[PDB]
């Protein structure tokens, strides 16, 4: 059996560094897969087979490191490569074998996750704590950002700002549509192609961000490339009624083109 789901407001959480270029005292606009501000994150207690879509923001408020790993793939039935990650603390057991996952995989206090592992084309090894992760798969490369912060709250995600560093990039070259978690209160938000306006301070820390599609005020802030908006009226975007459906109108023709006598003639001319 599995517990029913739940929902929570994400506030401003989920921001990561789009790249490793150092920037200080600047407002930088980046189009990337982000977790929209004040989004609707799914809250689970301790793990069904969630989808993956464009990417996944993950969060876990823990005190003993219960959640350890994840599974990625399309069918997860040894018919195609699947990425298994066992990233706990500092030990990682990443593999991309053609695993035959069990009906209800779990880890004891013991390693019983997959029944088979063949053709491993890749293998890599190396107050509460809120561990926040970002996973995506682009151009055959799997990117993982992470950030662990000490917080004191169990009712919901804290109301504040904190950025996620980049940690891992794997050359799995795998199609991922579904994923699941592995255990021995966690949140699963989805990333979307959003534009963000990040604020780097004198020390290069992203201490603030604006979600350019959250609301008209944020659109104004992104258009002005500033976090402060003076009194006035600002042209921020353009409005367009998108099409509802596609219409095709071809002539009512009931003959096949006699291309056989051209491409299949016995004797072509001089």
């Amino acid at each position: 059996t599995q517990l029913p789901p739940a929902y929570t407001n994400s506030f401003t959480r989920g921001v990561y560094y789009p790249d490793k270029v150092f920037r200080s005292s600047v407002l930088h606009s980046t189009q990337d897969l982000f977790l929209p501000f004040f989004s609707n994150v799914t809250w689970f207690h301790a793990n069904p087979v969630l989808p993956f879509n464009d990417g996944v923001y993950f969060a876990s408020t823990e005190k003993s490191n219960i959640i350890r790993g994840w599974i990625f793939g399309t069918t997860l039935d040894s018919k195609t490569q699947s990425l298994l990650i066992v990233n706990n603390a500092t030990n990682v057991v990443i593999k991309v074998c053609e695993f035959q996952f069990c009906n209800d995989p779990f880890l004891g206090v013991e390693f019983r996750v997959y029944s088979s592992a063949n053709n491993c084309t890749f293998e890599y090894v190396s107050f509460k704590n809120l561990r926040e992760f970002v996973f995506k798969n682009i151009d055959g490369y799997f990117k993982i950002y992470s950030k662990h912060t000490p917080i004191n709250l169990v009712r919901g995600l804290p109301q504040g700002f904190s950025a996620l560093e980049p940690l891992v990039d794997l050359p799995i070259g795998i199609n991922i549509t579904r994923f699941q978690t592995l255990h021995i209160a966690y949140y699963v938000g989805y990333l979307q192609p959003r534009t963000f306006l990040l604020k780097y301070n004198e020390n290069g820390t992203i201490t603030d961000a604006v979600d350019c599609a959250l609301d008209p005020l944020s659109e104004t802030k992104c258009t002005l490339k500033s976090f402060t908006v003076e009194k006035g009226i600002y042209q921020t975007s353009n409005f367009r009624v998108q099409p509802t459906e596609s219409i095709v109108r071809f002539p009512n023709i009931t003959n096949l083109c006699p291309f056989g006598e051209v491409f299949n003639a016995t004797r072509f001319a001089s």
Partner: nanobody
Framework: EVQLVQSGAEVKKPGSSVKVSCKAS????????ISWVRQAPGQGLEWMGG????????NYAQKFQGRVTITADESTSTAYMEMTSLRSEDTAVYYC???????????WGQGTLVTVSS
């Protein structure tokens, strides 16, 4: 290349109906003319009727105007010939021939024998 495979032989009592299918492989099915040809034992070839699946308007010979219904399904790339009120004279081999609009060659099936007897 292009291949036509028909359903197995049928044995029907007079007054019933038969429906012979003809599956095509090669991707030329939609833009072709699929026709059904009936050969009675000891008689010559006889063109019953044809259809272009892209259009779906069957055309039958004057002798087979009413007792034959020819259909084509592009989604399954299969041409069906359904004959109702089978008579003793309808005991014959039914081939499905095919002409693509890009070639003058013909693609024939293996022939399906339909025996109408009591």
């Amino acid at each position: 290349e292009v291949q036509l495979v028909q359903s197995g032989a049928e044995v029907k009592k007079p007054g019933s109906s038969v429906k012979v299918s003809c599956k095509a492989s090669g991707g030329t099915f939609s833009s072709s003319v699929i026709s059904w040809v009936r050969q009675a034992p000891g008689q010559g070839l006889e063109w019953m009727g044809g259809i272009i699946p892209l259009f779906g308007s069957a055309n039958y010979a004057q002798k087979f105007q009413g007792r034959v219904t020819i259909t084509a399904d592009e989604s399954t790339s299969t041409a069906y010939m359904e004959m109702t009120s089978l008579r003793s004279e309808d005991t014959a081999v039914y081939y499905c021939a095919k002409v693509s609009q890009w070639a003058l060659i013909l693609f024939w099936g293996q022939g399906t024998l339909v025996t109408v007897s009591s």
